[PDB]
Design an enzyme around this catalytic site. Structure first.
Site, short mmCIF file in Angstrom:
data_model
loop_
_atom_site.label_atom_id
_atom_site.label_comp_id
_atom_site.label_asym_id
_atom_site.label_seq_id
_atom_site.Cartn_x
_atom_site.Cartn_y
_atom_site.Cartn_z
NE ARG A 1 -1.09 10.40 1.81
CZ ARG A 1 -0.45 9.58 0.98
NH1 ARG A 1 0.19 8.50 1.39
NH2 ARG A 1 -0.48 9.83 -0.31
CG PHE B 1 -5.37 6.84 -3.20
CD1 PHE B 1 -5.02 5.76 -4.00
CD2 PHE B 1 -4.40 7.55 -2.53
CE1 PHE B 1 -3.71 5.31 -4.01
CE2 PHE B 1 -3.08 7.13 -2.58
CZ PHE B 1 -2.74 5.99 -3.28
CD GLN C 1 0.50 6.38 4.45
OE1 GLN C 1 0.16 6.76 3.33
NE2 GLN C 1 1.73 6.59 4.89
CG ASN D 1 7.54 2.10 -0.14
OD1 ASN D 1 7.55 3.12 -0.83
ND2 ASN D 1 7.21 0.94 -0.69
CG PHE E 1 -1.58 1.94 1.44
CD1 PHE E 1 -0.21 1.69 1.30
CD2 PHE E 1 -2.43 1.76 0.35
CE1 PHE E 1 0.29 1.26 0.06
CE2 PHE E 1 -1.90 1.38 -0.88
CZ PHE E 1 -0.55 1.11 -1.03
CG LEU F 1 -0.35 2.49 -5.54
CD1 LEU F 1 -1.18 2.52 -4.27
CD2 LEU F 1 0.79 3.46 -5.31
CG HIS G 1 3.55 0.98 -2.09
ND1 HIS G 1 4.11 1.64 -1.08
CD2 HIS G 1 3.43 1.84 -3.16
CE1 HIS G 1 4.33 2.87 -1.52
NE2 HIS G 1 3.94 2.99 -2.76
#
Lengths: 164, 220, 74, 220, 220, 220
Positions: free
Chosen positions: A54, A59, A62, A101, A112, A121, A125
């Site tokens: 992904r 951004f 991942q 997660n 990521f 975030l 995370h």
């Protein structure tokens, strides 16, 4: 003292470059040991030959699902999932390596690499490492991803291990 | 346990089966005598917490004593956490791991973490701390296993002074007290509880007489 | 007249006279106060009457003198 | 004690043999009746902790009560040392150091330090605090010597009201309850525990009952 | 009452019929239990003295209790008027005059003066004083209504401990003594009046007796 | 209790009477049962500490249970004061000082302070903390009002399995010792205490049997 691991990245089998990571084992030790051990493959299973499933331009990238290869799997060296170790370190910029997660205390093996500052975030995370060498290899990877994450070519961890 | 390996680099060597067999045999044959503490301290020199956990699990029977040992280990870990909490301070330039009450007791600490804490410079004395805890627990156990109190030790009418002083000193060693209390007890209780026939002999020698003088006096 | 180790309570001798005589002999005896701290906790409850022995042991090992007294009071 | 010389400096004086003889006599003669605390506070006035320790040690017998008093003094000293920090280091001349609990107890100090702490400006009532501790201990002792409780007093059918109220007020003086609770007790249980005849007499007397009118009503 | 409009002035509002219906229902069905005072203080919140007079007049029957309550209100008003001088003469505009005791009772004024006194700056709460007086009166009433005293409670041989402690705490709630006396009695007479079996059980329980521990000990 | 407005902000609102009436009725009619805690938590959502003190003081009867709840609230308040100590030094301009353990209960603070604490920025949930304390107290109360222990359950020869399992789960929900221990109990004690015929009918299905088949086996 803090371990350093590398990833030799590949785009459909053509070698693309090496990203190397400093793992902050002095603040997030159990999180850093799990990424270190999965990179060496010393516990029998790991990242070598898994792909970034992904990639969202601007951004993060991942990856780490070595069991199901699509974000629904992966497992840690402590069992399938473990606690959020702590939230000392924050998402301050590109190159920060943080744990993916499925809500709190669900860390496995997905991680990521941020390619931007993602302060939203924080507190959700665990951050446990940062790119040391290779950030333009992470940046070039963005071009093979999309707004929704789907990547256009297979991007793999061709080899990985510990350097120091 | 880790051991100095040629040359000068300590590497992890797993506990040998012969050591475990010796420990099981000494716990089977000698039960819980005062001497086991030294035998345990000598059988597990420089042992990682995992080795001491193995040696405490391999015991057969005496589960009550093992439970007291585990509970006292927990209490020592609790007190250790209370005596060693992280107070705010400037972070050290060099970071070394740190052993928690549960990291010392080998419950949640992986073998690699213990090897690190031991072989790192400066070393973290996790093995010696856990050994002190287990030794305190074993002292509790051997002081519990005492069949009779030291105050009840009395010589028989024809029981020779030999067996009397042997049993008295054995129970006194099993008993727990400060050294000065023992110094007072060996002078106030030993001569009084003796048989009158040899009690007169010990009284004739003197109050501050040594053990060998009395022993050769009532000899025969 | 007698040693502190010989002090023992009679079957119907009340706890009052027993503890009085015991503490009197202990004060007359000569020893360091640190030894007396163990001597009391080892000898006071043990030499008592069996019923009062269990009554004091029900209170606990580190029970104070006043609680131990009011236990068998009367 | 410390007698204050006429128009001059207060001079230290050893405790009088008459004072100590009267103290040991009243102890021996009356055991531990509720008036021994007022008589002790009367005999020991302006006395140093050394004088108070002497007056306590001259007591012969009642060693359980003496040990309880010493334990109470130890608890008070521990509380004082816990709620009062002790300074250390170099101390300026002409100013005594911080009095510790063991020093105010007189077990680790000397008459010179006691007189210095009692002559300082402003004075530190070491004697008045150690006497307060001794009075707390003596109160615990006299509460322990209480033969019967206060809630269990019942007037006999022939035993007169004068004797009944005498016993009731003696037990009330021995009682440990606070003064606010102590009042309700003498207001209610006095008339609630008497014999039926004078009970109905005092009930007809009604509220605002005072001891004088109660005793004049229960006459005959 | 005086409802505070959301982002607006505290508009006055007449007492709803539901409040008076619930009040007359509870005072009819439950007579005068200790809890009625809490329910009365709950139903009437921020109410003018006119509202409280309406809530008191609607009570039907038990006219002796109402007369005692009015006498208590009169005594409190007399005390207030005695310990507070009342000013007179020309009064500056925008500032209400001094509230009199007979006026703070609401018997010699209209709703406008009460609303003005409960809206002045700084506020002068007439409701919280008239309700305090009514609560004192209701406390006297519920004390008078209690059938048995607190000192005369004795547990039956077959009646369990739960019913005994229920009756004891109910009578304690009805008691008039101060809070320290209340603590004293609930500490002592609870175990001092139980049945001999569980009395000895609670005596074996010793000091620091806590209600749940008591009820878990007396089980069976 | 506070209530949101059209603009979104909240402000104090007087407690509704038919909430107090419903609470008093459910407390008296159902006495104490496991289903009083959900009703209490639903009735007083967002209630200030004054409203909770109202709902507790308004409960007439069962004064022993209310005293247990008061004692539990008392101990809980002390723990909160001990766990967090107020900081010293200058306070930030955008922030002001917090409440104490006793003021969380609302015993020594006015309603306006509670409203300011609940609608501050950031809001302080004093109401939720005191509600948690009251819920714990009510759990202890319903524990005390349990008429038997979990182990004493043994189904009679004629008592149907439905009534047995109903009584079992009733006293199990009234036990609340833990959650995993409850999971072990519902496996072991449920199967261990059946009537021999239906007992072996349940044993025919093995430990893998669920409750539905467990009951339809003995059914009919």
């Amino acid at each position: 003292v803090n371990p350093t691991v590398f990833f030799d990245i590949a785009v459909d089998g053509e070698p693309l470059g090496r990203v190397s990571f400093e793992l902050f084992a002095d603040k997030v030790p159990k999180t850093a040991e799990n990424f270190r051990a999965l990179s060496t493959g010393e516990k029998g299973f790991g990242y070598k030959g898994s792909c970034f499933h992904r990639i969202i331009p601007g951004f993060m990238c991942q990856g780490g699902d070595f069991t199901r290869h699509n974000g629904t799997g992966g497992k840690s060296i402590y069992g399938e999932k473990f606690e959020d170790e702590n939230f000392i370190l924050k998402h301050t910029g590109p190159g920060i390596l943080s744990m993916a997660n499925a809500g709190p205390n669900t860390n496995g093996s997905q991680f990521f690499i941020c390619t931007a500052k993602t302060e939203w975030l924080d507190g959700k995370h665990v951050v446990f490492g940062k790119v040391k060498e290779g950030m333009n290899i992470v940046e070039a990877m963005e071009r093979f991803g999309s707004r929704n994450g789907k990547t256009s070519k297979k991007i793999t961890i061709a080899d990985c291990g510990q350097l120091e | 346990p880790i051991v100095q390996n040629i040359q000068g680099q300590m590497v992890h060597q797993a506990i040998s089966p012969r050591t475990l067999n010796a420990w099981v045999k000494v716990v089977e044959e000698k039960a819980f005598s005062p001497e086991v503490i030294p035998m345990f301290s000598a059988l597990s020199e420089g042992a990682t917490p995992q080795d001491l956990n193995t040696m405490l699990n391999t015991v057969g029977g005496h589960q009550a004593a093992m439970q007291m040992l585990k509970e006292t280990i927990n209490e020592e870990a609790a007190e250790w956490d209370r005596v060693h909490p992280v107070h705010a301070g400037p972070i050290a330039p060099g970071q070394m791991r740190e052993p928690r009450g549960s990291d010392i007791a080998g419950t949640t600490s992986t073998l690699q973490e213990q090897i690190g804490w031991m072989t790192n410079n400066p070393p973290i004395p996790v093995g010696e701390i856990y050994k002190r805890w287990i030794i305190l627990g074993l002292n509790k156990i051997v002081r519990m296993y005492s069949p009779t109190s030291i105050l009840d030790i009395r010589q028989g009418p024809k029981e020779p002074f030999r067996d009397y002083v042997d049993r008295f000193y054995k129970t006194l060693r099993a008993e727990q007290a400060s050294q000065e209390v023992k110094n007072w007890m060996t002078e106030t209780l030993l001569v009084q509880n003796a048989n009158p026939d040899c009690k007169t002999i010990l009284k004739a020698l003197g109050p501050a007489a040594t053990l060998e003088e009395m022993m050769t006096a009532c000899q025969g």
